Amino acid sequence: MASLQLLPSPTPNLEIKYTKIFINNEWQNSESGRVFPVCNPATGEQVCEVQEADKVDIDKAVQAARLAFSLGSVWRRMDASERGRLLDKLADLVERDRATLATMESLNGGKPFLQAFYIDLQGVIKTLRYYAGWADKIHGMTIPVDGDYFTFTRHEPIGVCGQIIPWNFPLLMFTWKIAPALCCGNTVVIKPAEQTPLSALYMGALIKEAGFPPGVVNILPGYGPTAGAAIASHIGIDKIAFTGSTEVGKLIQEAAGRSNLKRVTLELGGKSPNIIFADADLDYAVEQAHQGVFFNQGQCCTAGSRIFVEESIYEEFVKRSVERAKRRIVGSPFDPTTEQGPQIDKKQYNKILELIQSGVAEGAKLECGGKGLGRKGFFIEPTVFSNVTDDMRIAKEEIFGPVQEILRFKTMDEVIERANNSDFGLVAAVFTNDINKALMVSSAMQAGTVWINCYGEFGLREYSEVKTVTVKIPQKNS
Amino acid sequence: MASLQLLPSPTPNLEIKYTKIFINNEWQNSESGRVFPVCNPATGEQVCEVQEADKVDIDKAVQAARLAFSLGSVWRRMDASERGRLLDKLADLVERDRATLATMESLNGGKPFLQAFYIDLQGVIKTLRYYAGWADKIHGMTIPVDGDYFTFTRHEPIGVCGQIIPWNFPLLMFTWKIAPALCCGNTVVIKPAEQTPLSALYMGALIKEAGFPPGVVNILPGYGPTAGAAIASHIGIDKIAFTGSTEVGKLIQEAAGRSNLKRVTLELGGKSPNIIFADADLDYAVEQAHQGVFFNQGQCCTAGSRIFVEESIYEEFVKRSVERAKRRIVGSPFDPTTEQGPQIDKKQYNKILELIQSGVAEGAKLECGGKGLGRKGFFIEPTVFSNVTDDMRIAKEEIFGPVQEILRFKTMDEVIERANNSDFGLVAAVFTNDINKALMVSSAMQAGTVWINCYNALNGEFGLREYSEVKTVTVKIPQKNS
Amino acid sequence: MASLQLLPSPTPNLEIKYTKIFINNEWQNSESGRVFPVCNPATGEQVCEVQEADKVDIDKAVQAARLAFSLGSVWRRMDASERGRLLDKLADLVERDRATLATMESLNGGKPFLQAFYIDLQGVIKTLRYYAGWADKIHGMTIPVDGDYFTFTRHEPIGVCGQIIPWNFPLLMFTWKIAPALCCGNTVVIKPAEQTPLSALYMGALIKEAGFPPGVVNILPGYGPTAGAAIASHIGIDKIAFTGSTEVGKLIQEAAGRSNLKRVTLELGGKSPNIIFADADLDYAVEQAHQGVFFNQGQCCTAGSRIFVEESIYEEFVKRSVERAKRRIVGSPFDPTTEQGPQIDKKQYNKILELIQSGVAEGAKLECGGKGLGRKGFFIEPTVFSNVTDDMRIAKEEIFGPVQEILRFKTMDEVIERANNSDFGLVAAVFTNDINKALMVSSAMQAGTVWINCYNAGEFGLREYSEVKTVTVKIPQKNS
Amino acid sequence: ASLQLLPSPTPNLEIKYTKIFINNEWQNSESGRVFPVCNPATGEQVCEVQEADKVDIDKAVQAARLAFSLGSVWRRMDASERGRLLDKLADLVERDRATLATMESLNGGKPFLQAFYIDLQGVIKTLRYYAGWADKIHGMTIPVDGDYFTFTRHEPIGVCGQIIPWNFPLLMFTWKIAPALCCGNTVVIKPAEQTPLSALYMGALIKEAGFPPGVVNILPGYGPTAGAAIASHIGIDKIAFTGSTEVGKLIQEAAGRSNLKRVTLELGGKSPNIIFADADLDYAVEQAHQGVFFNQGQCCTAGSRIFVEESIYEEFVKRSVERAKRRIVGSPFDPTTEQGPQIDKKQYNKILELIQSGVAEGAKLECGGKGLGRKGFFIEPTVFSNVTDDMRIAKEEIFGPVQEILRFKTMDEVIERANNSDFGLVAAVFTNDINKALMVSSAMQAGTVWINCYGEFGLREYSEVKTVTVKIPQKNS
Ligand SMILES: [Cl-]
Ligand SMILES: [Cl-]
């Protein structure tokens, strides 16, 4: 019929071609010989085996990285505009294999294909294009200094950069770190999460195809306590970018000073409050806060369970809020109709349910859902809680799964104080129609980023270092 | 009960000590010996006489600025941070003689003394201080160019800058043109308006005192067709900054192209439409809309007489606004209770009246006022027009006086399309509590500046760009590395 | 091993497909029906006829651009990042058809094909790609202001932009104006030079093909006094960008001021003196000072003919230079061995010869060349001059042709004063290994740009194509 | 010829300020403990100062926190006002310039006229400079895909902890207090234990100038106590440290084990000097000389090593020995002294044992070599010759009146040698050859490179970005 069925479609015939270590544009086997399994979070099944990299592999990776960054290097003499062209060529290859890549992100990470294809991958391509445009626009400056002097600065690449990311948005994270860093001229030694190194490894292929000189990007799959720690402590690594759990960041900053005091960056958790006001149109408020709390199986750090709602509407919202969760299609990620895929791990799976129990046995009125779904996979039903208070464990601890707490507040000053209670880290999503309330909240919110009625230049600053030069001149004249 | 007048007081009948041309930190008489009167718009009585500059005087002024800007010059070798120290020192003096400068301001422009003291002179001091901090923070860049090259850019002063400003905010205008230009290292030949040259001449005194090298700032009171025209057509002036009527704006650019292609900046008037949605606190909207329309005697490019009010509340707004006018205190600018002083001239005066007559004799419902006040000075009573339509003349012609027109609208697009109708130039104030309306309206407004729930005296980093030119240098290097 | 593996060539008698006015992504014919010829500067022969635009034509183009910039507009709602992709797509299309484009550039302006291919179109493609990147990186700011307020600024496009450019680098010039403007969201009404509009119109074809909304780019071939004058006086163009002679520049600003006070930008000529000190590698210096004086047939504002050499090396330099000219290959621009092409006009041609003679009849020592070459075309032989002094007409007037004048000098304070003396407009190139001389000079040269040990004339460029809109909101209580 | 004097020390300077400064109040250490401060020229005790510890550092933070809380005066203060305060602070410093330079010259043993004309010049200058930055710190409006509007605000971090050395007490204190205050932060600064006077004094000025209570807190004391108390406090948002790398490692480690606060480290580093034969031997010798002996050599911005090109290695060493040979070492308050004492006995010994080391390894001790007399920590101007990369005095850094003079031949040589450094590097090159100046300046792995001599990025570590994006009905360019 007129069914426009033809749309993005995954690929069950997806056989993982890239499962080895990527160093100096070559696919190597782990020095030890060890190999680690990669599992499909929707069926419990094993997708394939990947070469487990360790201390030794990290050394070679770093060696190629430093060589690729040396003064002779093709990566060091290459015009900046060319680095951009390469980031741009890479973006083109990502578009070409957009499906097979979006498939791994679905297959390997359990994220509903249509979402992996239309959201995640859009970002991957978007950021690669965007940063490709920054390469030759990174500017230094000439400074007017007292005295017969002429000083000026040049922003230069730090050198060898170590990167370590989580499993929330495997490809996206990998890109968000690769682009900025390459953009600035650095060389990379990136360690993807152990439960999601596929798309990362695939990018390695595209990178070599795009034309990046050997040694610029090195991808070493393996375990955190091993490879990730060998990086965070490696002596010949100038900087390190980490993003994941706070408890592990501490080990990173500490191993940083211990080693060689290399520059360090940590992208840590943080709670994600939401403050819906009575003046906001209930309908739109519900959907958005519902998508903001359930997106990416609710297990994404950029999500936020807690949802402060104004009393005048606390009634309806709760009811509407549960109707949605009820109709939410949870199924196989390859199914174009499923909205919620499985959780990433059994370890993760339990930590969620285990916290769902806490709530129930503490006053939280379970409005719907509450337990897992079936055999295999790691699905959990859309859980919505009611009558929640700040002293509960489900309100204190963040729920990294399909669980949304609905709280109630009366005064403004209130929510501001309640939502600001966060020990480092915070993101807010206010919903109003009142310029004043919006302005006040977005200001009083001790949050790194605020959204009003919805749920760049500062990026490539940590991937470059300043080099000032000052020259004595015969006589100075403005 | 313990109410004492701690309040600042306008020095009684100030003695105008400065009335001559200011060149090379020296006070000269007019080459021709000509002279022109300065008058009190509040009484219509003369205040003093000022030397009259002309072609020949402008010429000596340009020679002065030129020499003060040459390669060896103290002003050219001075550290940027020192120019900053000078702008700040000048700010100190303005603060010291703040009372007498606000006195001339009020005495020559007929503006309420307390306003000239707390608003105008606050700004004078503020902008001076502000640019002082900018002097050593103007940076250039280093660019990554393909090839084994290294290019960079310095931001250097332009040279001699001619400046011409109006009578609306004599001291503010003078300051806004001076600070940025000196800040960047230029030399100035500035021509105040013929009706308001005093406050400016006094600044010449403080400039010499502060420490500015001779020739850096040259002030020449005089007329447009002569003094101003000689500046615009001058073969030795590198840049000219003008603010005033668009009619004269055209002569300035033409003179420029016809003479030496000097750089040209034009600050022209324009309409300043107001939009009041029914969801805005009606009380605060009447005060603000009233303050933005009748401020500085309504005669100020930054004031918008026309006011679009939403039907749902048109009724009320018209009533609240007339009360405000009736209670509007209009008196001698030295009385600390006067909220409105006289219009600047008889010419201005007449233009407002005859224009007001039009409205009345065309449909507009004259809610109140409509004629002048007593004898002496150029005071006009707070007029308020209602049932005004776009087609009307008062609607198409701006009202540079104590006159406000209230119009009614229904849809949003309407207000927007209607308000947007203008020719090159537009400032706009909007009042709502609806974030969406504020946003739609703020973006859709073809204006250079938009205020949301406030008016404020209109017109940073973008300011000192016009007072400096870019110089780039690219060096061939052995090999380019990251 | 005799590797006759070659592969870079024009196109056999190219058929000029695009010769009509380009409005609203549509090819029109002049309202009047008038037409002007375009000629091959090498043969003197006619290449084709182009529709000649005038007042009326300009009006429609302005109308289409106007509509293309109005609120709801497709080009106005487009994401900035999308405007950028469009410029990148245009870059791609320019890459695909690079051969035909460089052919026209050569065939129409008379510049050696190989140079047009590897230089001019590299620039076109490079600039297009470059600005395609700036599109979503034009930021405004949040300003810490006094009181309980919050002010922020937005850099919006100006509106309808007229653009008028010369024949020196047809495609390069065109690109340099289009990219910055489109990159900022404006709409354009562009008028190429009467002697070189082909590459221009072809770009119109590519523009439509790339995806640009109709009305965004309008291209109108025609004459200066008519079409160019109607753009400068048009009551509905918000800004004009002109590059050409200072004499015409003067007229542009006047018309600007006498009409609607549109923004005006003038890219005028100027002198481009070079300075050569004994400490520089005489060999290298001669090679750079040579290309930079004979490049683009010497008729490139981005390069002067005057060269100040230090007494110590003046001798060897004069000989080193003459030997270079003597070995310069002038001939058909389609022949890959040719370095120098024909001058652009009969008019420009005579102006060069009359000027050469002048030098001869005034004392300058003609070391070589001094007259045209053969019949057909406007070629002039590499002409070098020795013993030249400032007071000489040739020294005072620019020699927009294949002619280098070599002036002698001794003290630094000297050259620095001589090089400077100029009425609005200066660019300088200095060769030395002395950080000191290089410094004193580069900071003393009243030039807009200065080259040290090289010679071949960003963020500030996309500033003239956008204006500032500052918004400020009143807020309950302000906190840092 | 009859002459006159004008620039002079505050006679028999008495120390009015010796307590801890918290909430614009002078408190006594909780423990009640007190520590001494000494004159490095004589060795005698100048006075005693209250000693802060974990519990004191605790009150300060409470003070700073409250002073940074929303409603606060300092948080609502127009940004232009923070600048006026800084400027008034610069004025108050100009007024008491003489006595401040006195303490700096009496506490750290630096020659008064330099402490007056140099050190204090920088204190006032940098205070004036940042005064001017306070209302010019901008965020941006970013064009975003979709119907959105996103903007950023550069806001102050909050509570900053500062720890500086004794090389330039006041300057250091100033360089760290200015940017931070300029950005709206509140401070808890800990001066070195051997030089707290000038700092504590500034405390009085800060209060006099009008800074609200709790914005700045000066807690003098020891590092393993006060310094660590700061580094680990759970309520300090950011920490700025400048000093030795060995302690830096403890700093970063501590901040990681605690609350993951931001950490900055201004650490050591060698300051090589390369001199070519083409540079003017005269200028070159005097410049390299002043650059290695300034502040008595005991200052990070001083580099012992001085690579000289063979062609002129001869004369350079001679002209240099003559220089050292005529350097006047005397009392800090005598207008003719060019070199005061070393800050400490501990630092004193180190310098000597390191001098003996060189002599005992091949170095050709051209002049000087030992201390001077009794009382004080003076050390005669030392100058080595024929030094090689392997020699200890060359590998390790000499923070005293000691200058080495290595020899070299090719450019590639010096570039490789001088470049050899494990994190941290600054360099000076002398030539009249643009190329060498370029090849070298870009090949040097230094944060800064000086050529023929020896801002905006500063106010960046004291603020964070807060991006906000609003949904709008429909977007238009
Ligand atoms: Cl004329
Ligand atoms: Cl006319």
Query: What are φ and ψ of residue A44, in 5° steps?
Result: 80, -20
D78 CB neighbours in chain C (<8 A) are 146-147
Gap between the Cα atoms of C39 and D410, Å rounded:
59
Q: Name which of B136, B15, D157 is nearest A141 in CA terms.
A: B136
DSSP-derived 3-state class of residue D249:
helix
Count of CB atoms situated within 10 Å of the CB of A410: 11
Whether the CA torsion B329, B332, B333, B336 is positive or negative: it is negative
D327, D336 in Cβ contact below 8 A?
A: no
Q: Find residue A240's DSSP bridge partners.
A: A162, A264
- The side-by-side arrangement of strands in the sheet containing A21-23 is A26-28, A21-23, A217-219, A187-191, A160-164, A239-243, A263-267
Q: Strands, E, within D249-343: which ranges?
A: 262-266, 273-275, 307-309
Indicate yes or no: CB of B442 within 8 angstroms of CB of C471: yes
Contact status, residue D35 vs residue D222, Cβ threshold 8 Å: yes
CATH architecture of C270-458: 3-Layer(aba) Sandwich (3.40)
| Proximal ligand: closest to the CA of B250 | 2
* Tokens at D19, concatenated: 């307590």
Q: D156 to chain C: nearest residue by CA?
A: C480
The pairing of strands D25-27 and D20-22 is antiparallel
D328-367 core/surface letters (b: 16 or more CB in 10 A; e: else): ebbbbbeeebbbbbbbbeebbebbbebbeebeeeebeebb
Angle, to 10 degrees, between the axis of helix C98-109 and the axis of helix C80-96? Answer: 70
* One fold for C7-269 and C270-458: no
Q: How far apart are CA A465 and CA B126, in angstroms?
A: 36
Instruction: Tell me the C-alpha distance between B228 and B221, whole Å.
Output: 10
Alpha carbon distances (Å) from C138 to A453, B245, C153: 25, 32, 11
CA C342 – CA B458 distance, rounded (Å): 57
How much of chain D is in helix, strand and coil states, percent to nearest 5? Answer: 40, 20, 40
Interface of A with B (CB under 8 A): 71, 76-77, 79-81, 136, 138-144, 146-147, 152-154, 156-157, 185, 432-436, 438, 452-453, 475-478
> DSSP states of B93-124 as a string?
HHHHTHHHHHHHHHHHH---HHHIIIIIHHHH
Domain B270-459 belongs to what architecture? 3-Layer(aba) Sandwich (3.40)
Quick count: other Cβ atoms within 10 Å of Cβ D201?
A: 24
DSSP state of B78: S
Token pair of D147 as six digits = 């119907």
User: Of C85, C133, C135, which is closest to A84 when you measure between CB atoms?
Assistant: C133
DSSP D371: B
Binary contact (C480, D141; C-beta < 8 A): no
C48: β partners? C38
The token pair that represents A444 in the structure block: 């009083």
Contact between residue A227 and residue A57 where contact means Cβ atoms under 8 Å apart? yes
Q: What is the C-alpha separation between D329 and D297, in angstroms, rounded?
A: 13
Q: Beta-strand (E) ranges in C4-125?
A: 21-23, 26-28, 35-39, 46-51
* Catalytic residue check, C301: yes
C56 Rama class: left (phi>0) / alpha (psi -120 to 50) / beta: alpha
Strand partners, C191: C164
Tokens, residue A313: 């509407």
SS3 assignment, position C342:
coil
**D146 contacts in chain C (CB < 8 Å):** 79
Supply the DSSP string of C51-67, one letter for each residue. Answer: E---HHHHHHHHHHHHH
8-state DSSP, C148: S
Nearest to A439 among C135, C459, C475 (CB): C475
Q: How many angstroms separate the Cα of A149 from the Cα of each of B36, C111, D438, D452, D453? A: 49, 44, 16, 10, 9
A473 Cα–ligand 2 center, Å: 52
Nearest to C386 by CA among C452, C444, C308, C285: C308
Q: Catalytic positions of D, please? A: 266, 300
In CATH terms, C7-269 corresponds, of 3.40.605.10, 3.40.50.300, 3.30.1490.270, 3.20.20.70, to 3.40.605.10
Distance CA C172, CA C175 (A): 5
Inter-residue contact B152 to B201 (CB < 8 Å): no
DSSP 8-state symbol, D370:
S
- Of how many residues is chain D composed? 477
Q: How far is CA A132 from CA A122, A262, C81, C89, in A?
A: 15, 26, 12, 15
Experimental technique used? X-ray
Pick the CATH number of D269-455 from 3.40.50.1980, 3.30.70.520, 3.40.309.10, 3.40.50.880: 3.40.309.10
Residues in chain C: 480
Q: What share of chain B is helix, strand, coil (3-state, %, to 5)?
A: 40, 20, 40
Q: What are phi and psi of C177, to 5 degrees?
A: -95, -45
CB C192 within 8 A of CB C165: yes
What is the enclosing helix (H) or strand (E) of C150?
Answer: strand C149-157
DSSP D273-286: EEE-TTS-HHHHHH
Number of Cβ within a 10 Å radius of residue C280? 24
Q: Which listed residue (A39, A105, A301, A339) is catalytic? A: A301
Among B261, B438, B476, the residue with its CB nearest the CB of C250 is B261
D277 Cβ contact list (under 8 Å, min separation 6) = D309, D310, D311, D312
Among candidates B55, B63, B70, which has minimal Cα distance to B218? B63
**C vs D: CB pairs below 8 A:** 90
Strand ranges (E), B363-468: 365-368, 383-386, 403-409, 427-431, 449-452
Q: How remote is the C-alpha of A44 from its chain's centroid?
A: 24
Name the residue among D324, D161, D129 with its Cα closest to residue D228: D161
Give how far Cα A253 sits from Cα of A37, A267, B260, D258, Å. 29, 12, 63, 11
CATH of A270-456, one of 3.40.50.300, 3.40.309.10, 2.60.200.20, 3.10.310.10: 3.40.309.10
Decide if B306 contacts B339 (C-beta within 8 A): no
Tell me how far apart the alpha carbons of residues B157 and B137 are, in angstroms, rounded to a whole number: 14
Q: What one-letter code names the amino acid at D96?
A: D
Task: At D409, give phi and psi (nearest 5°).
Answer: -130, -55
Q: Do A140 and B141 touch (CB under 8 A)?
A: yes
Class of domain D6-268: alpha beta
Which residue among the candidates C267, C339, C367, C405 is catalytic per the annotation?
Answer: C267
Q: Do B139 and A142 touch (CB under 8 A)?
A: yes
- Within 10 Å of residue B154's Cβ, how many Cβ atoms? 21
Residue D63 has a CB neighbour count (10 Å cut-off) of 23
Q: Is D76 exposed, middle or buried (0-12, 13-18, 19+ CB in 10 A)?
A: middle
Q: How many Å separate Cα A413 from the centre of its chain? A: 32
Residue C271 C-alpha to ligand 1 middle, in angstroms?
Answer: 24
CA distance linking residue B123 with residue B129, whole number of Å: 10
Which stretches does DSSP call E strand in B201-305? 217-219, 239-244, 263-268, 274-276
Which residues, listed in sequence order, are joined to residue A266 by a DSSP beta bridge?
A242
Are A102 and A10 in contact by the 8 Å Cβ rule? The answer is yes
Residue with token string 């002293």: A391
Closest CA to C177 of C468, C464, C467, C425: C464
Q: Tell me the chain D residues in contact with residue B461 when contact means C-beta distances shorter than 8 Å.
A: 136, 138
Name subunits touching C (3+ CB pairs < 8 A).
Answer: A, B, D
CA distances from A439 to A271, A422, A450, A451 (A): 21, 21, 10, 11
Distance (Å) of CA D173 to CA D202, D242, D268: 9, 11, 17
For residue A71, list chain D residues with Cβ-Cβ distance below 8 A: 443
Cα C76 to the center of its chain, rounded Å:
29
Query: Chains with 3 or more CB pairs closer than 8 angstroms to B?
Result: A, C, D
Plot region of B244 (φ>0 → left; ψ -120 to 50 → alpha; else → beta)? left
- Domain ranges for chain A, please list them: 7-269, 270-456
In three state form, how does the secondary structure of chain A look?
A: CCCCCCCCCCCCCCCCCCCCEEECCEEECCCCCCEEEEECCCCCCEEEEEECCCHHHHHHHHHHHHHHHCCCCHHHHCCHHHHHHHHHHHHHHHHHCHHHHHHHHHHHHCCCHHHHHHHHHHHHHHHHHHHHCCCCCCCEEEECCCCCEEEEEEEEECCEEEEECCCCCHHHHHHHHHHHHHHCCCEEEEECCCCCCHHHHHHHHHHHHHCCCCCCEEECCCCHHHHHHHHHHCCCCCEEEEECCHHHHHHHHHHHHHHCCCEEEEECCCECCEEECCCCCHHHHHHHHHHHHHHHHHCCCCCCCCEEEEHHHHHHHHHHHHHHHHHCCECCCCCCCCCECCCCCHHHHHHHHHHHHHHHCCCCEEEECCCECCCCCCCECCEEEECCCCCCHHHHCCCCCCEEEEEEECCHHHHHHHHHCCCCCEEEEEECCEHHHHHHHHHHCCCCEEEECCCCCCHHHCCEEEEEEEEECCCCCC
Structural contact between residues B174 and B34, judged by C-beta atoms closer than 8 angstroms: no
Chain centre distance of CA C425: 15
Q: Which two tokens stand for residue B366?
A: 């004259």
Return the residue matching tokens 């406090």. D233
Active site amino acids of B? 267, 301
Question: 């759970």: which residue's tokens?
Answer: D234
- What is the dihedral sign for C-alpha B18, B24, B30, B36? negative
Contact C246, C124 (CB under 8 A): no
Q: Which amino acid is at C431?
A: F
As a whole number of angstroms, the distance between CA D17 and CA B111 comes to: 51
- The verdict on a CB contact (< 8 Å) between C477 and A440 is yes
As to burial, measured by CB atoms within 10 angstroms (0-12 exposed, 13-18 middle, 19+ buried), residue D1 is exposed
